[PDB]
Design a protein around this ligand. Structure first.
Ligand code: 16K
Length: 280
């Protein structure tokens, strides 16, 4: 760490505190995260998982039982950008560009059998060029109240062997939040989170999700709520956007759209790469 001069505390992530710092050797400005042999091996594998929509993991430093992760630095997270854009809304072409890029990032990681598992606006980073990138990819497999708002229903229902579909669910919740300027399912407990999902998408049953009633935390005593139309859930999103969202929010992880199939969705026929309005 003698090679890094800390600049400021930029955040407090799930796996540790994130600092902006300066590399004394290269003059590089980085994001330094201060966090078991299995963890070293898994983290080392993430250094090779390089994609333009993945925050680059520059180095892994294991010194005095402490673990530091050195990332490329981006100037803002999507949560702060969404707060800054709350009175006007993020323009739909920029929402579409960000969703398209994030789907490219997920399609890449998922093709390498790497899951994020904890996507949230707080770990989506943006730059002045119009790029958006996924941070903390693969850290959940290796290792303040942790937000449940973007948690897939199979996780809340006790599935211990969940799939890449959990990331599609989280990204669908973020897509809805960019469009409406409000969190889709802002639960403050696991049951509140599950019941918020049920109140909007309907209580799942064996018809829409075969095997759901046999899940570890499923209870036959769950209240039975009717599903709502997406026209009510995400106005003023057009029919292509609502169709894609509905496929990202299917209850059955096996029915849920893949990142690769989502990239071919008609919603992206007119996708562009606009420049965001960023104040740094
Ligand atoms: C949860 C995270 N894990 C990593 C690795 C993060 C990461 C990676 C690269 N650049 C940045 N920039 C940035 C800029 C402003 C504020 C914040 N914030 O932490 O609130 C972050 N963060 S954020």
């Amino acid at each position: 760490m003698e090679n890094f001069q800390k600049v400021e505390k930029i955040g407090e992530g799930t796996y540790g505190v994130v600092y902006k710092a300066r590399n004394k050797l290269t003059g590089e400005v980085v994001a330094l995260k201060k966090i078991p042999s299995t963890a070293i091996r898994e983290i080392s594998l993430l250094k090779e998982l390089n994609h333009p929509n993945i925050v680059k993991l520059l180095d892994v430093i294991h010194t005095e039982n402490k673990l530091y992760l050195v990332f490329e630095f981006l100037h803002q997270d999507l949560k702060k950008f969404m707060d800054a854009s709350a009175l006007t809304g993020i323009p739909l072409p920029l929402i579409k560009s960000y969703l398209f890029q994030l789907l490219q990032g997920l399609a890449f990681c998922h093709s390498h059998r790497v899951l994020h598992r904890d996507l949230k606006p707080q770990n989506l980073l943006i730059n002045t060029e119009g790029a958006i990138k996924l941070a903390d990819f693969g850290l959940a497999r290796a290792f303040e109240v942790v937000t449940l708002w973007y948690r897939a229903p199979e996780i809340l229902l006790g599935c211990k062997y969940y799939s890449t579909a959990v990331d599609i669910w989280s990204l669908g919740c973020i897509f809805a939040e960019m469009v409406t300027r409000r969190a889709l399912f802002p639960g403050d407990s696991e049951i509140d989170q599950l019941f918020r999902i049920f109140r909007t998408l309907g209580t799942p049953d064996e018809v829409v999700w075969p095997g759901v009633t046999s899940m570890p935390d499923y209870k036959p005593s769950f209240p039975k709520w009717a599903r709502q139309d997406f026209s009510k859930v995400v106005p003023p999103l057009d029919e292509d956007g609502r169709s894609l969202l509905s496929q990202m929010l299917h209850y059955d992880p096996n029915k849920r759209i893949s990142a690769k199939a989502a990239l071919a969705h008609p919603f992206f026929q007119d996708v562009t790469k606009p420049v965001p309005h960023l104040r740094l």
